[PDB]
Every structure is written in structure tokens, then in C-alpha cells.
Write a protein that binds this ligand. Structure first.
Ligand code: HEM
Ligand code: HEM
Ligand code: HEM
Ligand code: HEM
Lengths: 146, 283, 146
């Protein structure tokens, strides 16, 4: 991923203020509320019947923490996203059967969550840098699909 | 489609927006030009510098149109009829760009409405902006005209008893050309010649046959299938465009005389309409 | 871009039978007929009101020939699409102001035209190889947009 040094610092600086477990649970719950067809993977997670039930589901929050934890460690490897996510790509394709469009939808919902969390601090150039990163991660996770 | 609770959510959110509509409209554009630079190709006649009067005035125009839409939520195609004409016949902005501005408008509201931007409001606002985008692009090619319906029935008539065979071919073309679609069939043998693919192709073809027979009443004829895709199978909507393309390629390869440019256009409009109906109950 | 031996052979085999003049004019004409908003770049070409007017328009045929001519030369450099199309990418962004989505629409139409022209010879594996190539060419043409 080629970001400018300015873009890298902007991404890095904001991420240092993020509570990964809270933002991860929020991002995954909003994904399941806003784009409900993504619930197809999570039928074992119990009650998803209302937005409140989704957002309060302990299994959704736990998965959110897992997903964003992997995202978070990926941010330390912006110059090598494909290699960092290679084995996870194969697992999502071969074993989990996740359509890579879902990574893009999570990307959009994460940007919204960051804007909601940080308000004016989430400026148009900072968003533009995060747009490159979420696209970069989605592309890396889809790379080994066959 | 927009439920009454959706409408209530949008009204409340936009009411809080209030007198800032214009400013937020300008911010949404700025976010879009920065994050999605290809959208600048539609504005080479503007000074796109930060704070420029052209971007500010355009933001206000966009925001006013949204205000009009919120106030006429029940009659959107009529309230935005003039704007739909303008984008369809004069500006001719590619429909993919509406999704980009919608996203940037959503980010702008999130950044400015901490208390109001709850999960359910987020869901409602996304749906609202999608509906606006749909209305604004609805005249690019418009409804199926009587000439379209004639062209579709003629081509499908020529398909005839081979409909099943062609459905299987289209699936096979899809699985090879767009491998991500294979994620929805982990329980199938997808190899060439597979009886599971052939049986499924026939089901898909049979459904298209029913849709052609009911072209003026497609939502009701396809209702059980809309339910099934939306609430059980839950296939991402993007995938319907890929199968539609592969069905068109299959017909082209089998219909050398029938696949004229006009019939090509009519078939592409027909499969987009089928795709719309099949995803109509997702949200 | 990488193509398997099988894919490259299929692409080059079929392209040797393509009359770029005839296919080029068909492809651009169908683009303007099927996706009429693409006509916004060709106001100076005259009458594009009806499909027969579009298909018979001599400037459409000429321009089509130019475009698939350039595409043809690109298939000579499949391993370096980006370097091959760099100068045309800049032209299309900076001078012509063409939304790169149009390159993907042209790709779709071209695949349909090859299928129409060649019939049963345009098999599913042959299509899949052309799908890779038209995506690669569209990505290459969009690369220098800013
Ligand atoms: C930034 C995007 C994503 C990242 C970094 C990510 C990462 C991960 C990680 C680290 C695992 C654990 C694998 C293991 O057990 O070794 C996992 C599992 C999983 N992921 Fe993804 N993921 C992402 C997006 C998604 C999305 C959007 C969906 C589906 C809507 C999804 C569905 C799943 C499922 C179903 C599992 C299995 C969990 C279980 O077995 O309990 N992932 N993911
Ligand atoms: C929510 C979506 C949108 C709404 C509500 C909207 C609405 C409007 C309105 C109200 C006008 C001005 C009409 C007039 O002054 O007569 C306009 C103009 C225009 N729009 Fe759209 N628009 C939307 C999306 C887009 C997108 C996605 C693009 C391109 C990326 C776009 C490109 C343009 C252009 C180029 C103009 C003309 C600007 C000028 O020369 O003054 N629109 N829009
Ligand atoms: C032209 C659009 C489509 C039509 C007309 C259509 C129609 C159908 C029909 C008739 C069935 C069988 C229902 C029954 O069991 O009676 C079905 C099932 C199914 N569809 Fe769709 N479909 C379309 C697009 C898609 C797409 C794009 C995908 C995924 C890439 C998809 C995935 C599935 C799956 C996974 C099944 C179930 C297969 C099985 O377990 O037998 N469909 N569809
Ligand atoms: C397959 C992708 C394409 C290739 C390889 C390609 C290539 C070319 C070439 C070789 C030129 C000549 C420029 C010069 O004289 O310096 C040109 C010009 C042009 N192209 Fe592209 N093109 C492609 C796609 C498109 C599409 C899809 C559109 C718009 C819908 C488009 C619109 C134009 C326009 C407006 C011109 C200028 C014609 C004039 O002089 O009036 N191109 N293209």
C-alpha cells in the first residue's frame, strides 16, 4: 500500500485514540443492522431480531473485537497488506465462504463509525487516507480468492 | 422500501441538520472529491479549491433538493422529476457515482450529529439516500417500453426449450469469470457438466420464463423468490449484475441473428429490472 | 498482469481472428446504444438518436477503430499494462475528463460482442480469460487519474 508519509501519520495518529474493542463491536453491529443480509454468517450468534439486540449481542461484540484486532495489527504493515493477510484471505474463501463484497461493506461502515466517534477531528483529508486503507485491506483479503 | 419508521428517522435527523444543510452539502462534496478523485471528472468547469463559491453554491443546491425530498418522502419521483430529467438527459453522470456521494453525505452527517446518528437512524438514512439515487437515475433508460417488452418476448421465444441449457451455461460462465460467486454454492459440485449446476440453471431459466410471461406484474410473480433471496439465501446484491451479464453473453453466443443492438439494450434493461425486484425486500 | 498459460493462449488465439475495424465499431456503437449516458463525450459526432443512427454513424466507426486499435496494441504487452497505457491514462483524465467507469462498461460490451461474433467458440473458459484482460486494461487506463 503506497500512502504518502502524511497519510500514514494521519491514519496512525487517529488509530492511537481508538478503543479497538468498542469500535470493533460498534462496526460489526452496525454492519449487521444497516446491511442485514450480512447476518447470513452469524446465525449461531443468537438473537439478532432488533438493532438493540444486535448491538447488545455479546457474540457480535466478541467477533467485532476479533475482526478489528486483526485490522489493527494490519495497520502496522501498510507497505505489505497482501502478505500480512494472505492466510486470512485463503481462510475466508476456502473455509468460511465469505463474499469479498462484505469486506467492502464493513469498510464503509467503519469509516462512518470513525466519523461518528471523532466528529470534526475526522476531516476530509483524514477520511481520504482511511478510504485508501479500508480499500487496501479489502483488496488484500480478497486476493487469494479462486 | 422506506417504511414509515424510516421516514420518521430521516425527518428527525434532517430537522436537526436544519439551517446547516448547505454547509454540510459543501462538506460532503469536498469529502467526495478528495476520497474519490474520479468524481472530479464531472466538474472540470469548477474551481474545486477548498471554500470556493462554486462548491458552496452547489452544496446548497444539493442540500435544498434533499430537503425537498425529505418533505415529499411519499412522492419522491414526483418531487424530483425535474432533477431526474436533468441528470438523465443533460448531465449524464454514471450511476455508480451516486453511491459515492451518498456515502460522503452519510459520513458528513455522522461527524455532525453525534447524538442522533444511532444504528437505526444510520440504517434509515442509508436507505433514504439509496432511494433518492434510484429516483435520480430512473430516467437514464426508464421503464420497460412496449418496444422493450416486444424485443424481450421475441428473443426469449427463440430461446424456447433451450432455456434450461442456457441457464446452466450462464452459471458456468459466471463461476469461471467471477470466482467470488462460488462462495454461495459450497454445497455444489461446480465442475463442468455437473448435474447440480444443470438442475439449478433450469430453475433460474424457468423463473426468467415466468418473469417474461408476467413482465407487467413482475413483483408479484417473483414474490416468493424475492423473499427467498432476501431472507434466506441473502446473496449480496452486487452479484445479480454478474449473472445478468453472463446471461447476456450466453444469449449473444446462441442468438447470432436476434441479438441486435436494440434487443441487447432491451434485454439489459429487462435483467436489471428482474435484479431490482429480486433485491427489493433486502432492507 | 499474470495470466495462466491456458488463458494467454486463448486470448491471443481468438484475437488473431478479430477484425479490429469491424469489432471496434460494433463495440463502441453498442456502448452508446445500451448505456446512452456515455453519449455525453461524443456530442460532436452528429446524430446518435436511434440505434440505427448510432451504428451507421461514420465517426462512431472511426473512433471505435482507433480505440480497439489501441486495445490491440495492449494485448502485445500483457505483462505491463500500466506502463503501456500510462500516456493514454493521463490524456483521458487531464484532457478528456472521462470517468473511468466508462472503461468497465466498454469492457462488458466488448465481451458481449465477441460472444455474438464468435458464437460457440467463445467458450466459458475463453470468456473468463477475456474478463481478466478487459479488467486489466480498464485498471491500467484508470491508473493515472488524480
Ligand atoms: C477487515 C475485515 C476482516 C478481518 C480483518 C477479519 C478477520 C478475521 C479473523 C482474525 C478471524 C479468525 C480466524 C481464525 O479463527 O483463525 C475471522 C473469522 C471469521 N470472519 Fe472475518 N474478518 C473480516 C471481515 C469479515 C466479514 C465482513 C465477515 C462476514 C460478514 C467475516 C466473517 C467471519 C467469520 C464467519 C469468521 C469465523 C468466526 C468463528 O469461527 O467464530 N469476516 N475473521
Ligand atoms: C444525492 C445526489 C444528488 C443530488 C440530490 C443532486 C442534485 C443536483 C442539483 C439540485 C443540481 C443543480 C440543478 C440546477 O442548478 O439546475 C445538480 C447539478 C449537477 N450535478 Fe447533481 N446531484 C446529485 C448527485 C450528483 C453526482 C453523484 C454527481 C457527479 C459526481 C453530480 C453532478 C452534477 C453536475 C456536474 C451538476 C451541474 C453543476 C453546474 O454546472 O452548475 N450530481 N445536482
Ligand atoms: C437472474 C437472477 C436470479 C434468479 C432468477 C434466481 C432464481 C432462483 C431460483 C428459481 C432458485 C430456486 C428456488 C427453489 O428452491 O425453488 C434459486 C436459488 C438459489 N439462488 Fe438465486 N436467482 C438469481 C440470482 C442468483 C445469484 C446472483 C446468486 C448467487 C451468485 C444466487 C444464488 C442462489 C442460491 C445459493 C440458491 C440455492 C441453491 C440450492 O441450494 O439449490 N441466485 N435462485
Ligand atoms: C478500451 C478503452 C479505451 C482505449 C484503449 C481508448 C483509446 C483512445 C485513443 C487511442 C484515443 C486517441 C487520443 C489522441 O488522439 O491522442 C482516444 C480518444 C478519445 N476517447 Fe478513449 N479509449 C478507450 C475508452 C474510451 C471510452 C469508454 C470513452 C468514453 C465513453 C472514451 C472517450 C474518448 C474521447 C472523447 C476521445 C477523443 C476523441 C476526439 O478527438 O474527439 N474512450 N481514446
Amino acid at each position: 500500500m503506497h500512502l504518502t508519509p502524511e497519510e500514514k501519520s494521519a491514519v496512525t495518529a487517529l488509530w492511537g485514540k481508538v478503543n479497538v474493542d468498542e469500535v470493533g463491536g460498534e462496526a460489526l453491529g452496525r454492519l449487521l443492522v444497516v446491511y442485514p443480509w450480512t447476518q447470513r454468517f452469524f446465525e449461531s450468534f443468537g438473537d439478532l431480531s432488533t438493532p438493540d439486540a444486535v448491538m447488545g449481542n455479546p457474540k457480535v461484540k466478541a467477533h467485532g473485537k476479533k475482526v478489528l484486532g486483526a485490522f489493527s495489527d494490519g495497520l502496522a504493515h501498510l507497505d505489505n497488506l497482501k502478505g500480512t493477510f494472505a492466510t486470512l484471505s485463503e481462510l475466508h474463501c476456502d473455509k468460511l465462504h465469505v463474499d469479498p463484497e462484505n469486506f467492502r461493506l464493513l469498510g464503509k461502515v467503519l469509516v462512518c463509525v470513525l466519523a461518528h466517534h471523532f466528529g470534526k477531528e475526522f476531516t476530509p483529508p483524514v477520511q481520504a487516507a482511511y478510504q485508501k486503507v479500508v480499500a487496501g485491506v479489502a483488496n488484500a483479503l480478497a486476493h487469494k480468492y479462486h | 422500501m422506506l417504511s414509515p419508521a424510516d421516514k420518521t428517522n430521516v425527518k428527525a435527523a434532517w430537522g436537526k441538520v436544519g439551517a446547516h444543510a448547505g454547509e454540510y452539502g459543501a462538506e460532503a462534496l469536498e469529502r467526495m472529491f478528495l476520497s474519490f478523485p474520479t468524481t472530479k471528472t464531472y466538474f472540470p468547469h469548477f474551481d474545486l479549491s477548498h471554500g470556493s463559491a462554486q462548491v458552496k453554491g452547489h452544496g446548497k443546491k444539493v442540500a435544498d433538493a434533499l430537503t425537498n425530498a425529505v418533505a415529499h418522502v411519499d412522492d419522491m419521483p414526483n418531487a424530483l422529476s425535474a432533477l431526474s430529467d436533468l441528470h438523465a438527459h443533460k448531465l449524464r453522470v454514471d450511476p455508480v457515482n451516486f453511491k459515492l456521494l451518498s456515502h460522503c453525505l452519510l459520513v458528513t452527517l455522522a461527524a455532525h450529529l453525534p447524538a442522533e446518528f444511532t444504528p437505526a437512524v444510520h440504517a434509515s438514512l442509508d436507505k433514504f439516500l439509496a432511494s433518492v439515487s434510484t429516483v435520480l437515475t430512473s430516467k437514464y433508460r426508464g421503464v420497460l417500453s412496449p418496444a422493450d417488452k416486444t424485443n424481450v418476448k421475441a428473443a426469449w421465444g427463440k430461446v424456447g426449450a433451450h432455456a434450461g441449457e442456457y441457464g446452466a451455461e450462464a452459471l458456468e460462465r459466471m463461476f469461471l469469470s467471477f470466482p467470488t460467486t462460488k462462495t454461495y454454492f459450497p454445497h455444489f459440485d461446480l465442475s463442468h457438466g455437473s448435474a447440480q449446476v444443470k438442475g439449478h440453471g433450469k430453475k433460474v431459466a424457468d423463473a426468467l420464463t415466468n418473469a417474461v410471461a408476467h413482465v407487467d406484474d413482475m413483483p408479484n410473480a417473483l414474490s416468493a423468490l424475492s423473499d427467498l433471496h432476501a431472507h434466506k439465501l441473502r446473496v449480496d446484491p452486487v452479484n445479480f449484475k454478474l449473472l445478468s451479464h453472463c446471461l447476456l453473453v450466453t444469449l449473444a453466443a446462441h442468438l447470432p441473428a436476434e441479438f441486435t443492438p436494440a434487443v441487447h439494450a432491451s434485454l439489459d434493461k429487462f435483467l436489471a429490472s428482474v435484479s431490482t425486484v429480486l433485491t427489493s425486500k433486502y432492507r
